[PDB]
Amino acid sequence: ATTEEQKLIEDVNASFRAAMATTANVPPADKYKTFEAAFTVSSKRNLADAVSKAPQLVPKLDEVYNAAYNAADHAAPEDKYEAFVLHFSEALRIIAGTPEVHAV
Amino acid sequence: ATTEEQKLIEDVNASFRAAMATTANVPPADKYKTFEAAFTVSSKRNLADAVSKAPQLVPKLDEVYNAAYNAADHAAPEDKYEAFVLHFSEALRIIAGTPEVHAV
Amino acid sequence: ATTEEQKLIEDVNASFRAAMATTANVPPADKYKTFEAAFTVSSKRNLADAVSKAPQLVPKLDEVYNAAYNAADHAAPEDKYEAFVLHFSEALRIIAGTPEVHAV
Amino acid sequence: ATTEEQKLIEDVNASFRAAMATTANVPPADKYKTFEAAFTVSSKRNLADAVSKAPQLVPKLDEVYNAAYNAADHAAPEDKYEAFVLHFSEALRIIAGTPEVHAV
Amino acid sequence: ATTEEQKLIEDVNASFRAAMATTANVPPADKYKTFEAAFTVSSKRNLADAVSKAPQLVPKLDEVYNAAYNAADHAAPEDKYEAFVLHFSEALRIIAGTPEVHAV
Amino acid sequence: ATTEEQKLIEDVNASFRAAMATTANVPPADKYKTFEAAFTVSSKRNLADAVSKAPQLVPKLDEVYNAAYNAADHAAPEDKYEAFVLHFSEALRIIAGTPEVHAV
Amino acid sequence: ATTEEQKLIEDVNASFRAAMATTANVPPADKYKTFEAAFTVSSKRNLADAVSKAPQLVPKLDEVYNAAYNAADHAAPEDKYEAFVLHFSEALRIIAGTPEVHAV
Amino acid sequence: ATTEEQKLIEDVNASFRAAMATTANVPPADKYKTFEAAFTVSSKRNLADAVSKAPQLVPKLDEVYNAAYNAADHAAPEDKYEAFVLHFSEALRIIAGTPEVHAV
Amino acid sequence: ATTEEQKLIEDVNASFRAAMATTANVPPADKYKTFEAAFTVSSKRNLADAVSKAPQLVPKLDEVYNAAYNAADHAAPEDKYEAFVLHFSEALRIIAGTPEVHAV
Amino acid sequence: ATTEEQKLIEDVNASFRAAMATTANVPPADKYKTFEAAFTVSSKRNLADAVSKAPQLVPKLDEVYNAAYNAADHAAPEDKYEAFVLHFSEALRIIAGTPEVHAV
Amino acid sequence: ATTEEQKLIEDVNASFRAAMATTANVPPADKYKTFEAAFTVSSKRNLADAVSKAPQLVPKLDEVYNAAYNAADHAAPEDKYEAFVLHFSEALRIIAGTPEVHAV
Amino acid sequence: ATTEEQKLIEDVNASFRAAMATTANVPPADKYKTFEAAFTVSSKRNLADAVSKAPQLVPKLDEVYNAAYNAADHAAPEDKYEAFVLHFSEALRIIAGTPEVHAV
Amino acid sequence: ATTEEQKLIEDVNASFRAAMATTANVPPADKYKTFEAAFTVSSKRNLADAVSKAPQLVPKLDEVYNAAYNAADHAAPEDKYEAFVLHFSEALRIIAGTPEVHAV
Amino acid sequence: ATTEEQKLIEDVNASFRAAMATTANVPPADKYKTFEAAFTVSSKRNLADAVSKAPQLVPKLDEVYNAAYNAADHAAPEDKYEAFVLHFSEALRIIAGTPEVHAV
Numbered sequence A, B, C, D, E, F, G, H, I, J, K, L, M, N: 001a002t003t004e005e006q007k008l009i010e011d012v013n014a015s016f017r018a019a020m021a022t023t024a025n026v027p028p029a030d031k032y033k034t035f036e037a038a039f040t041v042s043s044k045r046n047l048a049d050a051v052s053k054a055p056q057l058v059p060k061l062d063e064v065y066n067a068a069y070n071a072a073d074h075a076a077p078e079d080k081y082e083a084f085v086l087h088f089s090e091a092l093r094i095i096a097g098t099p100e101v102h103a104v
């Protein structure tokens, strides 16, 4: 039910956070490309799981993805990675119904 | 069905944009409280319309409101207004399924 | 009718009381987050039930959660849990039309 | 329609705040009954206005009065006034749909 | 006009009398809790009907309810039930304009 | 089954072709904006139908929409409309399994 | 799982890009013929791998192939090569779920 | 195993023969278009069944279709229908391992 | 009573698996401590049962508990939970005489 | 009734931690005096609860107190407070079966 | 009965004190190692005796062992030996019900 | 009931008086040590009996012990034994409700 | 609760210490009677308070009084006062659960 | 109520009379020690019953006990028993409100 949706959001975030980790030792120049590559893989699995376990969540997920890709797409190379991460995490919190979408 | 939801988003944005306008001629130190006052009024109408025309949209609307209010709540006085507007416009675009949630 | 609303309030309280129970053995420093996690799950179900059985109750419900969450949000770590429970218990009683909103 | 409700909430708060003012110079031991006397008068007008301009608001209003009245009713003489004001302020904010029901 | 008010009083009394009936078999230590539970349910319906059919009657209904609840609230456990019933039946008769408010 | 998917593709194309029609009498400067506005409305309905009738089709649909919007997004104002239409019809044909994706 | 599909897309693209390379030194009029010959070989392997590792991907792959062969099939000799490459790269991006299907 | 493949070939032929039937009462100039439309629908179902029951059969099936659509594609309007039917029937017999691929 | 020992191992595993379940919706940074809290409770009961039903099993049990607590103790916050579960799972299998201590 | 023991340990620690808090803004030389007074009060309640809910815990509890009181008793005035706290905290952890009795 | 427990505590202390003796002429950097080796041997015997003569004492014994091993585990090499001895001696006194757990 | 408590007091005194007897021949300097050793043994049994037969008596018993160990603890070596005996016997008489707590 | 008992012990000690004060300026021969007279008055009040606030404390209190009166009763005139004070302060400390019953 | 007090007096007297009976066959020299021993046991039970059933009776009871003990305390060995019995019965009769406190 609505449980499936929650769990999937957890997975997505996990994949997201893991891809971010891949960026640890890569130089700024390659950070976005590195993260992006790692994330694209795990994302598809997540999206597929959604398609069969919680279809209503698919378009929402597509929206957060789009939000991050588009933000980075229009940002200067140097800001792309940060632009994506920032918009993705907030967008995901919104989709999740999390009240504090900004920070601590 | 889904049309009602779209229309309501339009209304919300309209109320939002109008309240922002109330802020035009005021000095920065006041812009937030002025905007907030004007927006609180029109918001309630919008939320009520949602409750009877598209209930599923209510909790979402609540999330985009909380996004904005909470962002401003934790911001320095000088940034509150901008913090609210920025987070509100984006959160609403996300809820609307608008792909470009950042800017032009 | 108005019966649906009553029943939903019962459910909400049940979810609330159950999440509180989850806090049984965790040391004070974790009680809040633990409770928060358990409650966020069950809350969504309740809110969804409201959306289809008693929409007018949704905005009221969104109010109590905010009431509670905001109270804890501004409280010192040590008081957050108690701040939330206290304000949630009362806000729900108010929404329910219960005359004695404080205690025994 | 929802405008009438907002306006009435403003009036109620106004009556409330004014009665509190009556408590300005009275010695702590008589503050509550002094306040109580002043507030009982203005309340009736407000309630009547509600009955003809926004009936749905009446039961909500009767609720918040009972909330404040009952809290003070069970408090020690020395705490009655504060108990009433605190619970009334918050109950009214809840009924108004105000997200921050506690403080600044 | 005034017919609606009469009918509503009938309904209230009916709900009252029915809840009292719920108390039939229960022993003298539970009668109040049992009665209270049964009555709280039916009351809300009645109050809601009043809000839309005869709003002026709402605050009055609130007064008779309070009379009864408050009377029992300050009574010893053993007397609570009787205190409530006695004060409720009379308060309702008064609100109804019934000349013999005491007994046969 | 796979029938639902086919039908939905038909609907999408229909909405697309209709929005294009909205453009016949507008000169260059307004063509994209106009089309975009008309299409955004009908698209949401289609996407919603997909979410409940053929979820696997959602991400594919998100793709063609993405294909089209992005192509126009990076095109000079004068070419945006044509860029969108061209990429949309082809992407849709691909998603539909239509062998001749270019023209005749 | 969905990983197999991703990997196969990578392989396909690799075979594609390699065949394109074969065209590096042939004069325009032979570029297509040359490319076509080199690509036909490697394609079969890729398609076979799909048949056993990710069957659902086969019909999609067939589409992309058809997309390009058909585009070139109807193009003037001088444009055939470019027609194939353009349509193949985009069709593959669509099948891959790549949002930017056009260019940099 | 190999039974599934046989059965699917039967289905395909059935769909093919049925679509041909749709062409009976229409005049030649309309035969092809009509047949094509009817066949495109049923084909997709068949192809999908193949994807999950006998993947190795997919590329083969894609060959008969290709063979047919391409034969008609290059034929004069008047011959298209016959060109398709002739090539489809034979290609399918070849794929089926039927020794007499021409006629009786 | 080698039976008693077996049964106790079952209980321990049950308590373990249940505590893990408590970790179901809590964010990762909290999983370990949430799990730890839930497990510490049920563990004591199990250990006490061992003390009176199968004393020889007590020191073994303290060993698998130590194995897990120590593994997590020296792990980075992010790995603690996984470190504990992995080592506990295996250590218990070893103590149980289970030949496949790793996985499937 | 091992649950009762756990709960009591929680209470004891709570009383302990609270008394420590009483020491916050008092000058060092005043610390111990203050803490001791606050703690002696709450301790008795805890011990009494133990006497009726978990008697076996009483002598253990008397051991931690003796531990702490005696440690401070033999310490120089300047070290008494720290001597008590240090020994009390560890002794309680030992009695609780907590493996890490020293620190983090 | 309780005699067995006392005797076992004596044995444990004896083993402990003997192992300490082994540390007699070993250079400081080697003291903890040496002691640990000697103590691990004798400890097992003691623990086994407990398992059959006084099982309830086993879990307690594991606690004082864990107290000492953990204290040294987190101490700088130079302090490990002293950390272990200090925490072991006290933890054992606590388990024994000895009132003066610190020194004299 | 209260009988159990009386009997236990008798036992305690018996253990006490017996330990004192152990001191019969040892010279003054060692007298306290000797007595202490003998008494510590028998005391534990008595305390355990109390824990299961009369828990309320445990904390009282701890008081008498404490009273005696503390009195001797602060006495000069030469007076320790006498200090303990005197305070123990009197403290025990007080706990027993014996009116003449001093002598004959 | 157990709080009442504590408070009463405080009162008793206060009355005791106050009566002692009455003795400051009286020479030996009159000291006991003076103290005795002053104490007998205040004692009764204390005992009465106990009878209604903490009955279980009465017999204990009777014990401490008995200890003091009896000790003095058998002492030479010159020692009576000191005999009473000494035995009373200790007996009261015992009844209070105070560990150091002798001095500092 | 006052009944409880009466009943307790009956019990006390019964215990008293029974202890006296224990004295039937012992020689004068042991009479008082025999009676005293038997009575001390049963007295405690009675006093405890008073503490929970009729607290106001405790101090009175304490007072008669004291009357009898003290009378015997100051009597020659040969008269102790008779001194106690005589004063106890009369004292008890007085406490009971019995008019003839001397004899028949």
Ligand SMILES: [As]
Residues within 6 Å of the ligand: A086, B086
């Ligand atoms: As942002």
Ligand SMILES: [As]
Residues within 6 Å of the ligand: C086, D086
């Ligand atoms: As409050």
Ligand SMILES: [As]
Residues within 6 Å of the ligand: E086
């Ligand atoms: As009355």
Ligand SMILES: [As]
Residues within 6 Å of the ligand: F086, G086
């Ligand atoms: As193109």
Ligand SMILES: [As]
Residues within 6 Å of the ligand: I086
């Ligand atoms: As491992």
Ligand SMILES: [As]
Residues within 6 Å of the ligand: J086, K086
């Ligand atoms: As230490």
Ligand SMILES: [As]
Residues within 6 Å of the ligand: L086, M086
């Ligand atoms: As003494």
Ligand SMILES: [Zn+2]
Residues within 6 Å of the ligand: A070, A073, A074, B100, F073
């Ligand atoms: Zn863009």
Ligand SMILES: [Zn+2]
Residues within 6 Å of the ligand: A090, A101, A102, B087
């Ligand atoms: Zn932000």
Ligand SMILES: [Zn+2]
Residues within 6 Å of the ligand: A100, B070, B073, B074, C073
């Ligand atoms: Zn916040």
Ligand SMILES: [Zn+2]
Residues within 6 Å of the ligand: A087, B090, B101, B102
């Ligand atoms: Zn942004």
Ligand SMILES: [Zn+2]
Residues within 6 Å of the ligand: B073, C070, C073, C074, D100
């Ligand atoms: Zn806030």
Ligand SMILES: [Zn+2]
Residues within 6 Å of the ligand: C090, C101, C102, D071, D087
């Ligand atoms: Zn409150």
Ligand SMILES: [Zn+2]
Residues within 6 Å of the ligand: C100, D070, D073, D074, E073
């Ligand atoms: Zn009340």
Ligand SMILES: [Zn+2]
Residues within 6 Å of the ligand: C071, C087, D090, D101, D102
């Ligand atoms: Zn508050």
Ligand SMILES: [Zn+2]
Residues within 6 Å of the ligand: D073, E070, E073, E074
């Ligand atoms: Zn009241």
